[PDB]
Amino acid sequence: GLSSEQQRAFLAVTQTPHPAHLITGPAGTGKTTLLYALQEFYKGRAVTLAPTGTAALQARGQTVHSFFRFPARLLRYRHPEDIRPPGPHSPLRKAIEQMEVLILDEVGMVRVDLLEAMDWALRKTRKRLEEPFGGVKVLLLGDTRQLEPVVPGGEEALYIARTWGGPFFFQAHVWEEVALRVHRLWESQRQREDPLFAELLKRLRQGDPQALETLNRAAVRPDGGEEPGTLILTPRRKEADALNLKRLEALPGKPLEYQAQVKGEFAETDFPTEAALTLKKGAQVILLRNDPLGEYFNGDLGWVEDLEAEALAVRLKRNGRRVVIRPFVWEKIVYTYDSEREEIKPQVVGTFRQVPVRLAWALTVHKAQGLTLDKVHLELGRGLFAHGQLYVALTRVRRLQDLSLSRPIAPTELLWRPEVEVFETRIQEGIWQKSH
Template sequence: MKLYTDQTIARDPLPTDLDMNDEFKSAFDLMENTKECLFITGKAGTGKSTLLKYFKANTGKRIIVLAPTGVAAINVGGQTIHSFFRLPPKIIRKDTIKRLRDKSLVENLDMVIIDEVSMVRADIMDGIDYALRLNRGRMKIPFGGVQMVFFGDLFQLSPVVENEAKELMEELYPSPYFFSAKVFNDCHIRAIELSTIYRQKDSSFMELLNRVRNKEYAQGDLDTLNNRVQKDTAISKKDTTVILTTTNRLANTINQDRLSMLPGKEITYEATATGKFEESAYPTDTSLKLKKGAQVILIKNDPAKQWVNGTLAKVVALSNDSVVVDINGRTCDVPVVKWQKIEYSYDKDKDKIEDEVVGAFAQYPIKLAWAITIHKSQGQTFDKVIIDLGHGAFTHGQLYVALSRCTCLDGIMLKRPVTHRDIIFDRRIYEFKGRFASLF
């Protein structure tokens, strides 16, 4: 296995062609020069992640970045909400929140950024509020006086509420979404919607996507989409177009089926995990099985800029300690990458918040990619996709996410027609957006 160097530690550098448009500058200015509570949102492909990374690299404020899941935290170079605040894995109540052993970090915070806020339940948001009040000794001020900045798209990922918690959540909150938290009765959110779309350039396709997103579509829109239906016989198993599925089971079945069809020796690459790197946060397989000819997706930007996160490739050579892929006719040697798990600490002498590495995971930044789930495709961009809705979309925004992965309508193939049932609409999100319409 090829060892990583400092240059192959998994970081996503800022794009060199960063577009500092007016809305980007305005959002940065509000984050840097005000203390307002901000919700930064936008359709798929509008640069939310780029803005977050840019702010993190250029702010003069003492900030931490948190996320609801281990994978999301690793991707943004932050810490999970639960690990930072020591929250229990259940419905959060005030009596479940404890004082932190070292309060100096929280006491010296200027800002908390929460990424993928659409996945954060209302009770967790109230838990964050109470934990900050408690540990900063400012019980009467929302979030203990810390500026909060939320990034996410409510039309994409939704919060997960386990079956056993649904009844209690329904008693406590009007919805599971973060904006239903009680803290927002006393804390005004200013919402900023980034609107410049960098993924799609086809204006008619962008308009269709927007109608699907807002459930303002007409039968003609379904007809347009369903013109993209291809019979199974027309989709060859030799087709390299990535298949988007609604479930992990279907994606795994397709990938293992395609891998088994390839001739030649299968090689397994074992990851190494050290320190406090939980299995739930592993960014790829611990036992990565590959063959020559396998279709894969690269899941981290290359510092040498040979590929970006989401690039599709074909394995052209394997040995026990190397993986070589073909990317659009270019041969690239893929190194092992180290992902780091960090926790935050406060350096009193420097008056600075430091990132402390507490765990690491090393593996080739590769996944099999004949098929991936719609959920895991978020943030990716493809020129062509096959969308397999199986028994149907089952959660708010799922169809929109699948369609919006593609750069143009002509690049989409559907395995079955889209129906009205596949366009799932949560009115509570539209009611929230309506309350803050003047701010978007």
């Protein structure tokens, strides 16, 4: 059963014809758990999406990209080359046409161009350009104090700035057409049996510098990452590799190497996994691509069972089922700027073919947002770089005894986005309306 404030948000969302709602609150307040109640109330009529694979599985839906078949690149505003409606007799078109409610968890990580593309895709497929999201009622859930959207730094960043003025979902132009009603949750549920830890996280969210000093004294334990049953989180992918390789070549099985084929321009900075990736039987892994046959998805955690030339078997954590993994192809897209028409054109400059698997004793903080973890050791590596990164790493566990840091954290390490301050200030009035 839901809590009291969860039930108020349940009724305030399902008892009103209003088409746009946001349920927001600190990490672990029960937003995705109330999302489960919304899925039972709506079940056939609702589609549930999340921006990342891990969040999508945590919300028991799929990624936004996978549902609308969006390409994994910048979705220019209302651009036909990027937002293509489904076929005349496709299962997607009937899904979009029959759909009545769109639930979107972890909306804080949804970049503005992704949200505007959903708006346009729903309008175009339902043949209602007049109405935002094509008449679909959208239920948004997330926290803007958690991880900001991912914005690579090419002309992709300049376009987003020019078109919307920022990468956040609340900067979409559709909010000039609808008022977003805001429901707020406050009471901790993940940390409900450790109120002092919950109070600490509340103060850390407010930016308290003395809260950070109390955390540095209580939680800095360098060897925390070697205690059993501990998931390690890091800011960067390659820092996770160095940590996973330590636990990997400590396993008894025979190692097998999967060598990627790189074509054209594809820097190893952009590799989703290592070009020389070594696995062992029993290694803990996370899957990086969706199965066309639907047996596994991006974000699936599991353990290697068999290793052969270009095919490995993985036992999944999600359902205890055994799936077979084969190499996928990744495209590397860059954006060039025409001076004459003054437009950006995407272009493929390289490919990367490899088994879609990473070792998963250590993960990036981005792959952890939304998870409730039993034990977390945060390895800071070469520092934090994303707004909301530290706060997400700290709030995955239930009790402070389940958390440890590799080194103390300085106040000057902390990132604050001014657009998030402006947003979270106006939302306490209960409404978000983008003017002009």
